[PDB]
């Protein structure tokens, strides 16, 4: 039973869904007053353009955000990463929803929405993406998370949006898809010394996972300003084969792919004709070693039309290694299963569940999920 989630417009777990549409009607009359927090706590919309406020959020998440199943690593999203992730085109200040202690002003809670146009089967809907739900460790198991969720819902409803997309490691009613975490060792000595990885020699293991010093695909180079239109084109066309995807404007494409050091890398393949035919991309997200830092790259969007996908991703691994990353991480979504085993990815523990709020539709396999979040 789900004390919070049974009250929400989402399908029941183990409801075979054969329909397509919203769970409830669009509200045409929205609660104007913030939801009531427990005594001693108050809402505060966080201005991330104020360096002090950004730092406070960084610290909250640094000290209180997601850990792995073994509680040995915690994601360490940087200030600059958070600005990229939370100020894309159409970001709204009121959707950076903090909770503060009244007496001290200490930041103890967060949740965020960013707008996104989502393609789900035969339907394209303006939605939001919910990320960075975080309650301080000392406030855990006090039902603050439902208040954070209800409040962002209200604030999103005020802007005329009635659906959301989100992911979590926990099972809630009801996943649209389920992904699996895969990791590719780049610096196996560090991964073993930090206990990320564990009848093999260390000699043998370094040999197994050794990569070329430079990439193999002809005409690979960083994405530049001039590539924004064609990257947009490649991504728009490539994504049509999946059943859950973003629909990005050209400005959105600039935001999410244009390289920024230690945040996002995108490389394009420009062939012998001067035509851009493929791209790869990965984002930067380290983890604090509890139980100093583990440098990890996360596979983002990888589009292929002329270069085989295996080669693209092989080049992605080489570039990640050149840039000092200890490990390259990917999900089993899109066509990722075609290369994961072949490029010596190992499977992880944990599931990433994909979810829609206020949208009833059939579930899909991971291979039909075409949406990658931060
Ligand atoms: C139209 C617009 C709609 C927009 C809204 C769309 C929905 C957005 C939904 C959110 C998308 C988030 C996307 C991400 O960022 S996923 C990452 C979430 N953050 C973390 O995992 C960081 C570490 N953990 C924490 O900070 C806390 O443990 C959190 C904040 C997770 C829960 O705090 P706490 O441990 O103190 O619990 P509680 O007593 O307050 O509340 C217990 C209730 O909350 C349910 N719960 C637990 N974990 C999650 C979870 N990850 N998504 C949704 N619900 C969750 C739980 O089943 C129970 O409900 P029920 O079992 O009684 O029903
Ligand atoms: C060692 O460092 C850490 C620290 C905390 C948790 C984890 C496990 C984990 N939850 N991984 C992913 O969600 C994940 C795995 C593969 C690819 C992408 C992954 O996550 C994305 C970035 C974080 N939000 C979910 C998507 C590892
Ligand atoms: Mg709580």
From Swiss-Prot:
Alphabetical GO biological process terms: in utero embryonic development; ketone metabolic process; N-terminal peptidyl-glycine N-myristoylation; positive regulation of establishment of protein localization to mitochondrion; protein localization to membrane; regulation of opsin-mediated signaling pathway
Function: Adds a myristoyl group to the N-terminal glycine residue of certain cellular and viral proteins. Also able to mediate N-terminal lysine myristoylation of proteins: catalyzes myristoylation of ARF6 on both 'Gly-2' and 'Lys-3'. Lysine myristoylation is required to maintain ARF6 on membranes during the GTPase cycle.
Keyword set, alphabetical order: Acyltransferase, Cytoplasm, Membrane, Phosphoprotein, Transferase
Name of protein: Glycylpeptide N-tetradecanoyltransferase 1
Cell compartment(s), UniProt: Cytoplasm; Cytoplasm, Cytosol; Membrane
Positions that bind tetradecanoyl-CoA: 3-5, 132-135, 141, 143-145
Similarity section: Belongs to the NMT family.
Bilayer topology: Peripheral membrane protein
Catalytic activity, reaction form: N-terminal glycyl-[protein] + tetradecanoyl-CoA = N-tetradecanoylglycyl-[protein] + CoA + H(+); N-terminal glycyl-L-lysyl-[protein] + tetradecanoyl-CoA = N-terminal glycyl-(N(6)-tetradecanoyl)-L-lysyl-[protein] + CoA + H(+)
EC numbers: 2.3.1.97, 2.3.1.-
Full protein stretch here: 116 to 496 of 496
Main location per the UniProt record: cytoplasm
Tissues/organs with expression: Heart, gut, kidney, liver and placenta.
GO MF annotation terms: glycylpeptide N-tetradecanoyltransferase activity; myristoyltransferase activity; peptidyl-lysine N6-myristoyltransferase activity
GO cellular component: cytoplasm; cytosol; plasma membrane
UniProt effect for mutating residue 77 to A: Reduced glycine N-myristoyltransferase activity
Superkingdom to which the source organism belongs: Eukaryota
Annotated phenotype, changing residue 370 to D/K: Reduced activity
């Amino acid at each position: 039973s789900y004390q919070f989630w049974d009250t929400q417009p989402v399908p029941k777990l183990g409801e075979v869904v054969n329909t397509h549409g919203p769970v409830e009607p669009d509200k045409d009359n929205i609660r104007q007053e913030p939801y009531t927090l427990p005594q001693g706590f108050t809402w505060d919309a966080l201005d991330l353009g104020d360096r002090g406020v950004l730092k406070e959020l960084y610290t909250l998440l640094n000290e209180n955000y997601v850990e792995d199943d073994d509680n040995m690593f915690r994601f360490d999203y940087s200030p600059e990463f958070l600005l990229w992730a939370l100020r894309p085109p159409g970001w709204l200040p009121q959707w950076h929803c903090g909770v503060r202690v009244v007496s001290s002003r200490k930041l103890v809670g967060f949740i965020s929405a960013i707008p996104a146009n989502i393609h789900i089967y035969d339907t394209e809907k303006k939605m939001v993406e919910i990320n960075f739900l975080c309650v301080h460790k000392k406030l855990r198991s006090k039902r603050v998370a439902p208040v954070l969720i209800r409040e962002i819902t209200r604030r999103v409803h005020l802007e005329g949006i009635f659906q959301a997309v989100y992911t979590a490691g926990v099972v809630l009613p009801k996943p649209v898809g389920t992904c699996r975490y895969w990791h590719r060792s780049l610096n196996p000595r560090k991964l073993i010394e930090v206990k990320f990885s564990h009848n093999m020699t260390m000699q043998r293991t370094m040999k197994l996972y050794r990569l070329p010093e430079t990439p193999k695909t002809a005409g690979l180079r960083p994405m530049e300003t001039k590539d924004i239109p064609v990257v947009h084109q490649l991504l728009t066309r490539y994504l049509k084969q999946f059943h859950l995807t973003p629909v990005m404007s050209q400005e959105e494409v600039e935001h999410w792919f244009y390289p920024q050091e230690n945040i996002i890398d995108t490389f394009v393949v420009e062939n012998a004709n001067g035509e851009v035919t493929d791209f790869l991309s990965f984002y930067t997200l380290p983890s604090t070693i509890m139980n100093k830092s583990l440098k990890a790259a996360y596979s983002f969007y990888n589009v292929h039309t002329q270069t085989p996908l295996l080669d693209l991703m092989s080049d992605a691994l080489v570039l990640a290694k050149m840039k000092g990353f200890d490990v390259f991480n990917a999900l089993d979504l899109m066509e990722n299963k075609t290369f994961l085993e072949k490029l010596k990815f190992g499977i992880g523990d944990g599931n990433l569940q994909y979810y829609l709020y206020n949208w009833k539709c059939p579930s899909m396999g991971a291979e039909k999920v075409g949406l990658v979040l931060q």
